[model samples]
Target: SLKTLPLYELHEKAGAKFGAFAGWRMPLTYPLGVLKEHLHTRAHAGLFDISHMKLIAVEGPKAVEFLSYALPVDAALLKIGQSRYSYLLNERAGILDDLILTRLAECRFMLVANAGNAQADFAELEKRAFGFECQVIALERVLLALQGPQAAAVLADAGLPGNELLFMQGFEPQQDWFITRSGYTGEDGFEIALPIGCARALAEKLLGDSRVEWVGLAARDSLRLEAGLCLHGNDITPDTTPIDAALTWAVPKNVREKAQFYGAKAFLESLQKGPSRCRVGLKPQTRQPIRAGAVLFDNEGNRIGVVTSGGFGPSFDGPVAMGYVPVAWKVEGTEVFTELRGKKIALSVHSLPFVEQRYFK
Candidate 1:
């Protein structure tokens, strides 16, 4: 049998329908259903069992120095207790994986990576740590996302003292409690990493608050889309470079100026000229949704690019998607069409962040 999260039984007890997600039996939703679950998260707060994510810690004097060379971003500028969204890229500057790297101290750092890509990320980190005198520790734990507008208040009431911890900051995770003001949902919230043994208790306590409810993966997908945040496999892949994916901001200015760090030269080289195509947001004129792998075409039906991530955003209550398109056609209001069920559905290129992000500073 495949492994389950610490809250497996509690999830069943909450009347949640379980499903296979990234190699774990996690909840799809509570009995109230996906739509209501989506609404619940938007209205107040929602809890997601993300224990499958890997929590890795890197400790050593060169931790910051080494990471700057290992990743595209300059780690020295990363303040203690601050996490930055960055990428590990190969020599060609292709993305190995997108992740959050937190600087715990001058010699200590914490890295949170996607569950499905943990092994690869770990292997790469280990490779980079070989000569740096850093100790890499992977904590076996379940991570949780408590997200929504009132997420801070709910977590603060639960004894996390996380209200002061702004987005992308966390440290010394306790066995059952550690709150980070970081969330995937467009709403404000925290992503907590906890011990599997304490998941049920923590989830129960969080749910006891009137503002918090258990959210499922279904709603999570929609919410992330609304935030215009790119999902790894969909919006980005081994074949996609950061510039092509519209994630240039992840490349800090100093790294670009110094021409230092892994793939810094190639990364800058790509931008010095420009990408063949760029990531762009989309909103279909009709209700018909544009999905992954769909062909995108210009007004004359000439094949332009392909869709990466797309779906009906529950928050926006319309079809929203993102994908790569030629430089000229990537702007907002550029007329484009996506093939749906063998028919060209009328669509237009739009700017990302279909919705505004409400993060606690």
Candidate 2:
């Protein structure tokens, strides 16, 4: 059976269309079409149920030591209440999952991991923590993101000063509500985490704002498509490494110099030698959305890689996609083609983000 969120009823009452995502019964869209859902957040703010994702808590004297050794980003770099993106890799630098790690306190952390890999991630953390002094625990949490230009105003009206928080900083004025100034929707946004018991209250509170739209998975994926962010299973998997996944920005120079984490040897070497393959943004020359499993070819007609993630970017109103390709063909403006149903469509190599960022910065 597919898993469901504790407050799945909210989606039901909100008239959401459900679909399977990462083994969970998630909302695909609301009464607003998928097109409108994406445009809604672009116009105002939209609420997303990220509760399907899991939170793993790590605490104890060796918390920093353990996390720094397990992830590419150094745990010591973040101050209390600060969060940043990182990856959980195997010994060979293969990406097991991507994560948003928050330092809740001096020796405590909350790791936001993909719902599909949540169980495996916790087990891996425990296995790695065997000799360390830190303790790892899994807990239930709800994360709802408000993405758009007006995201700040809504939270402010709710008596939270989310506007005062800088990017990546979180503020917890009450016991159960933890709000952060971060999101992956290609806009300045706010994300909040609350205990499951506090879920319905906050959900209703945000929905009460007429400007706040009910955003579901379809819009969320398409929004990410325009932003050129990778969807884990499709774009990067156990077969892919962090260096090739456009994740170099997440690893700081100081952290890479120390090189104490898993797969550091190969990972560090790649920073110098460069990975053999690279994941890149693919923009179809036409409006037709190129989809996953479609075959790609070079200008010379040589079959190359395959499309990983692809969709109609409702925000940008065009087709957007991402794929692995030859490092030589990954430059901006480089042209490639995808063969769909015996027809080849021309595409260009653009950097991540087929669209411009909002001025909310």
Candidate 3:
């Protein structure tokens, strides 16, 4: 049986089209449709039901130390109320998952992990904490994301000074509730983690605003693609590393200097030698929207890569895609081709973020 998020019934009542995602029955789109939802988010605000993701708490005197040893980012470098993105890796330096970690207190931290990898992530953390004093606990909470240019305005109207919180920062304004100035979309947004009981009231309150609408998974995927964000199972997988995924910026200097975290040796080696292939953004020269699993080819007609995520970018008003290609061919404006229905379609290697990001700096 497919699991359901806390907002499943609420989404159903709002006329959402349902689909299975990461073992959960999630809203794929609403009656307004994916195209409108995608464009709405870019122009206004869109609320997202992200309760399927897991919220984890790491608490102990050595919580920071434990995290420093477990993930790529140095937890000790983060100040209280600040959050940083990082990765979990296997022994061979393959990406296990990507996550956001926030420093809540001297001895308490929070981690938001991918829904599909939550169980494995927890188990891995536990194994790594055998000799440490920290304890990892998964919190039962409802996560909601309000994204787009008008996100801050919506939060301000609700008595929260959303503009004050910088990107990648979070705080607890009320007991048992947390809000972060962060989101997956490349737009100004806030992600609220509330108690299950407080979720319905808050959702209703937010949706009542004329500037906000309930967005679903289909639009969310397209928006993220336009923003150049990677989906775990699609763009990134256990076979890939941060080096090849174009995410080396998430690695801190100290973490690279010491080479102490899990899979550090292999990661360091990859950093030194350079990745054989690198992820890059693609733009179809024509109106045909490429889909995932489409084979990419070089000028010589040799299969060189595969599209990981691709679709019509509503915000860009064209087809966009993300895929891996040889490091030599990943440069911007490099010509490439994709075979569709036995016909060769022209494409260009474009810079990521098809749309201009309007984040509140």
Q: Please give the RMSD to the true structure for each candidate, in Å.
A: 1.8, 1.5, 1.1
Better of 1 and 3 by lDDT: 3
User: How much RMSD separates candidate 3 from the native structure?
Assistant: 1.1
Q: Give the per-residue lDDT of model 3 (tens digit) for 1-361.
A: 9888887789989999999999999999999899999999989999999999998999999998899889987788789999998888998788999999999988989999998999999999899888799999988999999999999999999776557889999998887788899998899999999899989989999999999999999999999999999999898888998889988888878889977789999899889989868899999889979999988899999999988999999889999999999898988999888887788998899998998887788
- TM-score-based ranking: 3, 2, 1
- Model 3 TM-score is 0.98
Please list the residue runs of candidate 1 whose C-alpha ends up more than 4 Å from where it truly belongs after superposition: 1-3, 173-178
User: Candidates' TM-scores?
Assistant: 0.94, 0.96, 0.98
lDDT of 1 by residue, 211-288 (tens): 888888877878888899888878888788898888988876777897667777778888887886889988888886
Candidate-wise lDDT, in order:
0.81, 0.85, 0.90
Clash pairs, model 3 backbone: none
Native-referenced Cα lDDT, model 3: 0.90
How well does candidate 2 score on lDDT at residue 26?
94
What global local distance difference test value does model 2 have? Answer: 0.85
Q: What is the alpha-carbon lDDT for the whole of candidate 1?
A: 0.81
